[PDB]
Ligand binder design. Structure first.
Ligand SMILES: CCCCCC(=O)N[C@H]1CCOC1=O
Ligand SMILES: CCCCCC(=O)N[C@H]1CCOC1=O
Ligand SMILES: [Co+2]
Ligand SMILES: [Co+2]
Ligand SMILES: [Co+2]
Ligand SMILES: [Co+2]
Lengths: 275, 275
């Protein structure tokens, strides 16, 4: 019978406008309107399934921040990640007695700095990623982009560690990985190619892992509120509606990428698991 | 020999983030990064052509602002328009000795509040608009909304005045209206359906009227910088690169929708014209 764990991988801050576009626009009464630097959780999900362990997302690399950090100086200043050692993914998995080598599948929802940071650890797993997300990230690496949401040094490590990539093709969807585990292909929106997961647990029922396809309950609405920069704005809205449709049709609970209030209410890996 | 006039229809202010997405993101060093309330021009272009007068865009309706105005209270607070009487389109046309009835074609770049506000004046002209922009605007009208970029009162007047609509089909492009005057179909991006104009003047050469397909030189780049909330982000970028291509292939100047610096340099209708 499967078990699902939520692993707390620390906290990030950023301009609220990144999360909710134009959340507090300047007005005639408030012409120099101040923004807020909001804090939110970075997390990963491990499903201990009889057919093999599945990891959804990988958080940020431990070598991300600081003077030796792989993240560019501007990136560090705009999206600072705060994490104690116990929050690092390798330690969260050790606390669960799971070796990186024990992971059969890693699902990269996309290849942003806060989701693909530790792909390099999983050299025996099949790494599942949207083909267009893979292409886009690799182009950034080829252009030697040292700032932004695709981290040059993380990509460099994925290449050096010769990972076992499986790309989800842009027309593929509802990819069954194991009994009750299905990859949802949301396509372009937040990024070039977004993957989610539907998990059917015997007791808890249906769960949809949305990652950055839906940042928060405020994003989800209604009304739907898009993020402040967005690769494909039409695809973003289409993807949120797809998530709502699947949630309704399957009676599933939607887990957002970065909702503080929702995350606070989750049972974490240190206290237990879902079933 | 044609003559082209730039008519000054006042000024609007708004949060700079509407114009340039995330122009000044909050950082560790400034967590409450202030925005700014920028000012920019609203303008229209009249081409006095031997085959007939052609108007590109129509500015804002004179009854837009004020507690008893057509624009919603929230919209007025975020996008205030200031205009002396001489700036109203009917007055700018009167100053040029052009009656509304003398206009043969009006090109509605799109149907937003600051470009379609005076369509109702032109009851003898053919009103040229993208089919999907027309559909979208009419749907908002049918929903009886009081806030947003599509103004119920304006649309209500277009219908009651029985305008002579010609829709440009989504796959139609490079539509010749007169010698040296060609409609460019940019499609969806900033809005559902954006139209621009290419004008070939004997002395001045090529001019592309971009309207809201490109707000400003800063938008145009490179790098291209999209607006804070964008309907179709991929379409927006495709449309900017189409404008760049056409400008290069035809050696044309590009006239942005709302660039303060560029507009200051234009010869206005009270001082003269282009040929
Ligand atoms: C430089 C633009 C980066 C914007 C997108 C981004 O990387 N946003 C983080 C915040 C949490 O989820 C993310 O991926
Ligand atoms: C509330 C969405 C705003 C849509 C964008 C818009 O209407 N922007 C104005 C500002 C000047 O050019 C425009 O059309
Ligand atoms: Co992301
Ligand atoms: Co994220
Ligand atoms: Co507009
Ligand atoms: Co405009």
């Amino acid at each position: 019978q499967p078990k699902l764990y939520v692993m707390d991988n620390g906290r990030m801050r950023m301009d609220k406008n990144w999360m909710i576009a134009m959340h507090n626009p300047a007005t005639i009464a408030n012409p120099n309107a101040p923004t807020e630097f909001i804090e939110f959780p970075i997390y990963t999900v491990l499903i201990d399934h009889p057919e093999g362990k599945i990891l959804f997302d990988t958080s940020c690399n431990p070598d991300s921040m600081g003077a030796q950090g792989r993240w560019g100086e501007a990136t560090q200043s705009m999206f600072p990640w705060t994490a104690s050692e116990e929050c690092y993914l390798h330690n969260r998995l050790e606390q669960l007695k799971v070796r990186p080598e024990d992971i059969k599948f890693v699902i990269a929802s996309h290849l942003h700095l806060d989701h693909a940071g530790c792909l390099e650890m999983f050299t025996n797993a099949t790494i599942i990623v949207h083909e267009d997300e893979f292409s886009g990230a690799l182009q950034t690496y080829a252009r030697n982009q040292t700032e932004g949401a695709y981290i040059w040094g993380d990509i460099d490590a994925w290449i050096k560690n010769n990972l076992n990539w499986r790309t989800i093709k842009r027309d593929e969807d509802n990819i069954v990985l194991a009994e009750g585990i299905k990859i949802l292909n949301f396509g372009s929106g937040h990024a070039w190619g977004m993957l989610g997961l539907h998990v059917q647990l015997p007791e808890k029922g249906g769960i949809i892992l949305a990652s950055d396809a839906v940042y928060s309950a405020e994003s989800y609405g209604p009304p739907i509120k898009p993020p402040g920069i967005i690769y494909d704005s039409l695809g973003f809205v289409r993807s949120v509606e797809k998530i709502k449709r699947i949630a309704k049709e399957t009676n599933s609970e939607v887990w957002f990428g970065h909702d503080s209030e929702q995350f606070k209410r989750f049972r974490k890996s240190t206290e237990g698991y879902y079933e």
